[PDB]
Design a binder for these strands. Sequence first.
RNA 1: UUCAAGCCGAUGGAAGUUUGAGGCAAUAACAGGUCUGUGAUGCCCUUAGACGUUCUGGGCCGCACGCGCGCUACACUGACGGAGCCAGCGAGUACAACCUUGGCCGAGAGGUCUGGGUAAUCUUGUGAAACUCCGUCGUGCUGGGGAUAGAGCAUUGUAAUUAUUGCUCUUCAACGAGGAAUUCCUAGUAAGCGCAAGUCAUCAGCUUGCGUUGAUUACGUCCCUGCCCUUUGUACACACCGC
RNA 2: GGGCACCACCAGGAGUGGAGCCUGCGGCUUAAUUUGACUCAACACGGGGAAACUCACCAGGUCCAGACACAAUAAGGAUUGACAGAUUGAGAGCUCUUUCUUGAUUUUGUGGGUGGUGGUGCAUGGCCGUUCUUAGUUGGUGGAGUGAUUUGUCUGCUUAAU
RNA 3: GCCCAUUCGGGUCUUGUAAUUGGAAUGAGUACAAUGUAAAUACCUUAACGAGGAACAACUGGAGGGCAAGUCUGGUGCCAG
Lengths: 55, 96, 69, 56
Amino acid sequence: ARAGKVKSQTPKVEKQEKPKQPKGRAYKRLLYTRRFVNVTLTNGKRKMNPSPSSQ
Amino acid sequence: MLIPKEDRKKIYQHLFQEGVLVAKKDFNQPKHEEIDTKNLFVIKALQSLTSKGFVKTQFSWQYYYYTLTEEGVVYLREYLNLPEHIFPATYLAGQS
Amino acid sequence: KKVYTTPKKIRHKHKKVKLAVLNYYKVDDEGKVAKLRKECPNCGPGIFLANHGDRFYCGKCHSTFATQK
Amino acid sequence: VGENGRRINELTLLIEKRFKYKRGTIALYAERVHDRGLSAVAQAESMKFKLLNGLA
RNA sequence: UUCAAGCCGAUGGAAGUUUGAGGCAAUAACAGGUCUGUGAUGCCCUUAGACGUUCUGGGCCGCACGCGCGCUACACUGACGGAGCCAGCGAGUACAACCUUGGCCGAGAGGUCUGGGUAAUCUUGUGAAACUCCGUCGUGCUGGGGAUAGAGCAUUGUAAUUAUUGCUCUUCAACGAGGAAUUCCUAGUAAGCGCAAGUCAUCAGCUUGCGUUGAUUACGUCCCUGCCCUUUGUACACACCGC
RNA sequence: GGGCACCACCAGGAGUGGAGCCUGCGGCUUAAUUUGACUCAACACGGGGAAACUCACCAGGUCCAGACACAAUAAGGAUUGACAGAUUGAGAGCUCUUUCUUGAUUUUGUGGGUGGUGGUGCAUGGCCGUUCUUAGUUGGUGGAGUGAUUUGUCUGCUUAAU
RNA sequence: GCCCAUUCGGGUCUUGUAAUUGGAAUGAGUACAAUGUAAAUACCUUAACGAGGAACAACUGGAGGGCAAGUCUGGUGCCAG
Ligand SMILES: [Mg+2]
Ligand SMILES: [Mg+2]
Ligand SMILES: [Mg+2]
Ligand SMILES: [Mg+2]
Ligand SMILES: [Mg+2]
Ligand SMILES: [Mg+2]
Ligand SMILES: [Mg+2]
Ligand SMILES: [Mg+2]
Ligand SMILES: [Mg+2]
Ligand SMILES: [Mg+2]
Ligand SMILES: [Mg+2]
Ligand SMILES: [Mg+2]
Ligand SMILES: [Mg+2]
Ligand SMILES: [Mg+2]
Ligand SMILES: [Mg+2]
Ligand SMILES: [Mg+2]
Ligand SMILES: [Mg+2]
Ligand SMILES: [Mg+2]
Ligand SMILES: [Mg+2]
Ligand SMILES: [Zn+2]
């Protein structure tokens, strides 16, 4: 089309029934854990949202 | 693919005896070395085998090379009848 | 490239007109058998002649008769 | 090597088939390379492997 | 020659041009070529009456005509006959059919029998040509020149007409050294001359090499052409096919 | 301004360009006269001297070489074969005449591959050509700049050559 | 973290993950009451019921840089954005 062709063309994938990421302070706690407590692995450098290791 | 089944059987037997197979990449060739069948037919058979696992194929220098995996060997045995403690080239015959 | 020519007439491989339990051979008594047409002279019995208007052949030797029967 | 004569044996057989030889007249041996880094082909192969794997 | 780098000349020396000739040959690139060397390959196309394959007959070779490598000649430093008669690179078959001497047949091409060679051994001294000698034509589109032509004889292959090539006779065209232009070249080079393998069943005017004959003129310069740097100027940076 | 080079010119040679003929490439022609490449760095180049093959083009025919997955027939045949002449360019079963063989290979679909001298070298690899076989290129200190950078790598004279 | 690291491993001590499960609250809701109040509401106070992923459920914007955070997967292919 020549008026929002792309929105109509895509396949609608459905929201997966995943568990709630808890609200308020819980989230903050989780974030903290992710950051400073657990300490993510680094070959040389830190990274917040890593990739599946590939090109 | 259109094989007189006897020929196919013979080919299989030969393969079993070997533990290996070397073919040309030469279609139109009337009869293969060793086996008394068309080379093309043999090649086709090998291809088929590869498609259902079994054989490992290399196409280098107008010469197809073929070796049997354990599963392939088992399949061959089944096709034949021969039970256990048999030829291929998975182990030596005696001392060589 | 250049466009394809398009006369029209296509020819396919014939499906063969398969037929089994064919009306050749017979039995009248029950115990013994009564062969229809004839068997091959060149090859052994079991193979049967093709019957036409003074023309015969057989398929195991692709097609190799001449004499009538 | 494989597991005490297998892959090597197969290779030998293949060779024989190719070049009309008899069993005994071909003898394969699989040896180590004295310093891999000095070799070039090996290095290239390694690089290729790495690429295949998916590395920076 | 600031008596440096070097260069120039004699002497000796096989060699005094980087001793000659090449082989390799940096950084950065080019939208240069090759996806028709490639089971090197992305993606697209196609994908069982294929744009796959495979047979059969053609076609790449057609001709008002342009340019580009080339060969053959415009003869007397020749042509034609005899006679003399000397190279170097090579290459060459047993599962095929290679080079093929030597003997007989044939004007030739080419046939045949026989060998020798898997090769410093045999082909092969590849007694190659251009050359050299004595004779025949003498400066006439002539015996220069050999094209187009017709016929037959050969060979290769399954197949030779759209002459494959060779040979035999016959036909004798254009062209008396080529305007504007422009290529190549500095020594065993240039040019001539043939051989040689490559492709190849058969075809050399091609090609990579080879040797034979063997000069003229510089041994300089930036006039042209290109390229290189330096200094300059720049509204350019996809960079003058620019903006 | 200063260099260098017979792919520049001088001093000369041999030439080509003219002639005929070979062969490339255009243009036209042609069913089709397959394609790649056009200043040097396209044009006796593709090792490209094509008789078929090669071959990609055309006119025509043949063949599956449709791997594998999954169902429709599953022997009351899946499909394989097939002398005889018409058929056919044609001792191509190419088929329509035929009524014998062939035995679960197949084959009819649906996933899925495979091949392509099909395309795009301005999507790539490798190789090659060309700038250039010219004399060019770089970085470590140290100095000049805030800096991009620069100097080294240069007036001169030498050399084939930073 | 480690008593010891002939190989283990107990795990004696401490942390995170499982539609396990279990005990202990909770007020957001409702609701006698009493409070408030001019009268009411609502607040504060209480009895009683009311949580287990199906709820007694947090949205908004962004995820190349500026600028915190995806060279994830498909759909698109100068389009629509
Ligand atoms: Mg066609
Ligand atoms: Mg030298
Ligand atoms: Mg000799
Ligand atoms: Mg004359
Ligand atoms: Mg040639
Ligand atoms: Mg040049
Ligand atoms: Mg040609
Ligand atoms: Mg040339
Ligand atoms: Mg030819
Ligand atoms: Mg191909
Ligand atoms: Mg391709
Ligand atoms: Mg390119
Ligand atoms: Mg290009
Ligand atoms: Mg510095
Ligand atoms: Mg500098
Ligand atoms: Mg969101
Ligand atoms: Mg967004
Ligand atoms: Mg997003
Ligand atoms: Mg960021
Ligand atoms: Zn018969």
